[PDB]
Amino acid sequence: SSLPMARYYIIKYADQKALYTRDGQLLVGDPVADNCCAEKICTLPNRGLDRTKVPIFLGIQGGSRCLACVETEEGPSLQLEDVNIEELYKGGEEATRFTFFQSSSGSAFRLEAAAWPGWFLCGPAEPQQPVQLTKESEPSARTKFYFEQSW
């Protein structure tokens, strides 16, 4: 049976900060200062969700763990889960929780939660704070990421 070919990136935030992982969290900063390397992050399209946008899954560690929304009474947050990116690619409605709409903002990219329209991936404001979701209308530096494709 055919296999998809995931795209890979190094993903940066403002001021050359990079996405990386430690202790089960997706973090942003200088990976080496936190005893890590910049994470090779992969994506695959969610083909069945909305063919008019660019829905994707976001995975770390060769796509072994993927970013998901989790609903709380204070709104959605994000966490990495033990679900691999091929399991999402071949899945169904349960994959919507792991889906983000990828769009351009000039030379940057923004990622909107498919499960929570209007909520976007947001960089941390505190050291060692995981990536956040924020409800942003007017695009800003807080939601702008830089995808540098490697595969």
Distance CA 70, CA 141 (A): 24
List, in sequence order, the alpha helices (H) in 46-122: 85-89
* 142 phi, psi to nearest 5 deg: -65, -25
Of 128, 45, 57, 63, the residue nearest 97 (C-alpha): 57
Distance CA 20, CA 58 (A): 13
Resolution in A: 1.3
Helix/strand/coil for 102:
strand
Method in brief: X-ray
DSSP letters for 19-88? EEEETTEEEEE-TGGGT-----EEEEE-TTT-TTS-EEEEEETTTTEEEEEE--TT--EEEEES--HHHH
In CATH terms, the fold of domain 1-151 is Trefoil (Acidic Fibroblast Growth Factor, subunit A) (2.80.10)
Only one residue has tokens 């936190």, namely: 34
| Domain ranges across the chain | 1-151
